[PDB]
Amino acid sequence: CAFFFPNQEGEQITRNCYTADGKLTNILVYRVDQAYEYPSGMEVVANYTFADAAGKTLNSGQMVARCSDGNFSMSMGDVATFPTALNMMNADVYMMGDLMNYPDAFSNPMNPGDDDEFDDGTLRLYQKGNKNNRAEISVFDREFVTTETVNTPAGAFYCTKVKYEMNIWTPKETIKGYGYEWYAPNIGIVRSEQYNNKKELQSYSVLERIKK
Amino acid sequence: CAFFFPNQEGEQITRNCYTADGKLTNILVYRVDQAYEYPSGMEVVANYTFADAAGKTLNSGQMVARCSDGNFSMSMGDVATFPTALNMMNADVYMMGDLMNYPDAFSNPMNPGDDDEFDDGTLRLYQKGNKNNRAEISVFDREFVTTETVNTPAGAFYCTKVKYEMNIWTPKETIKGYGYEWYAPNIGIVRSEQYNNKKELQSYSVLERIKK
Ligand SMILES: [Ca+2]
Ligand SMILES: [Ca+2]
Ligand SMILES: [Ca+2]
Ligand SMILES: [Ca+2]
Numbered sequence A, B: 001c002a003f004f005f006p007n008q009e010g011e012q013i014t015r016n017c018y019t020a021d022g023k024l025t026n027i028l029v030y031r032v033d034q035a036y037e038y039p040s041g042m043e044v045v046a047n048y049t050f051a052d053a054a055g056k057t058l059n060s061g062q063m064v065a066r067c068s069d070g071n072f073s074m075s076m077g078d079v080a081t082f083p084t085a086l087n088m089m090n091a092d093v094y095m096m097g098d099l100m101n102y103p104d105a106f107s108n109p110m111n112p113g114d115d116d117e118f119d120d121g122t123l124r125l126y127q128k129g130n131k132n133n134r135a136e137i138s139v140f141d142r143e144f145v146t147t148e149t150v151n152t153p154a155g156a157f158y159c160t161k162v163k164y165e166m167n168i169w170t171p172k173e174t175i176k177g178y179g180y181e182w183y184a185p186n187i188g189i190v191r192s193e194q195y196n197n198k199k200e201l202q203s204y205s206v207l208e209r210i211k212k
Helices: A077-081 A083-088 B077-081 B083-088
Strands: A012-019 A024-038 A041-052 A057-068 A071-074 A093-097 A121-127 A130-152 A155-170 A173-184 A188-196 A201-211 B012-019 B024-038 B041-052 B057-068 B071-074 B093-097 B121-127 B130-152 B155-170 B173-184 B188-196 B201-211
Touching: A024 A057, A024 A077, A024 A083, A024 A201, A024 B121, A024 B130, A041 B093, A041 B121, A057 A093, A077 A083, A077 A093, A077 A121, A077 A130, A077 A188, A083 A121, A083 A130, A083 A155, A093 B041, A121 B024, A121 B041, A130 A173, A130 A188, A130 A201, A130 B024, A155 A188, B024 B057, B024 B077, B024 B083, B024 B201, B057 B093, B077 B083, B077 B093, B077 B121, B077 B130, B077 B188, B083 B121, B083 B130, B083 B155, B130 B173, B130 B188, B130 B201, B155 B188
Parallel strands: none
Antiparallel strands: A012 A024, A012 A201, A024 A041, A041 A057, A057 A071, A093 A121, A121 A130, A130 A155, A155 A173, A173 A188, A188 A201, B012 B024, B012 B201, B024 B041, B041 B057, B057 B071, B093 B121, B121 B130, B130 B155, B155 B173, B173 B188, B188 B201
């Protein structure tokens, strides 16, 4: 039963967000606030902060990572690293999504293309006091690609690679596309990449720092 | 696409909680804070307050009810009306659960015993600053029983009746049992009842007031 998120109290993970041209747009910081033990597995409550490239905080809140029975799931905070999301955030923006599951390829092996073990999820963001500033990010058809080492500024991590489709709606536009993400035990998302339906890179994020 | 929760801004629903002997233990109050429209359906953010029989607030927070595509789901706040939950709550207690789905029997008819349309869910509660005060409520094997009118102090509502099993764990004890709930469009839970595995009534709740 692997836990795909940091789980030591006080531990802090930083992930950087980039434009397709490699420019830094945002910095996401998670800090483990509390880890609780349950017979069926663990519960981790973490604080998140989303800031811009100059370190100004755009949004902060709490999220949860958990193991129940054999199964790990967590809040969809990470899909908020999509540019549409990052660009509409401020202190009055809130978000709600499903807890999304992350299968353990490393113990339960999967063939490339396996998808029935991955659940779909929808994240909605909205500004309190300004309803027009809202968004919906739907992630679906997630499937296994491979397991492989990914090299990042925080180090080299053996990861599970997943491919997914997504729909992003705001009152001003619909964007359709696809993405990849790579995740690892005790870290969560190590790397992600977003594309439009023409296969043109829109953005990406990479694990930048682990502070235990 | 029925929405099983109040959805007019400002609307307020009160549900009363009782011991098996009919004594009032707690009062739960939901107030619709904001309703947001998305192409795929609606998002409702509501504030909840849990109080004791004398009106002293035990816990408050926010929760979400939503329609996405054809499917309604919501936070598991209502399973917090179990006595173990009610009795451990204070201002420093927080809770996290899955968004749990509520099928629309009224449009998509179900035969008694149908269960594959209902998802399982786990709610965990914990006190910040006092880890020993925590709990887990697992709800599973939910299935359709019937549709029928239920008479309450707020009125008579045509409801879907569901049966479920549950496991309740705290560091001091495990309780195993089963329950029934009745839900209706634009209200949510109209009535619920909890039993232990000997079929002895442990508690119940009934819709008390709708203020639009
Ligand atoms: Ca497949
Ligand atoms: Ca498939
Ligand atoms: Ca059945
Ligand atoms: Ca079945």
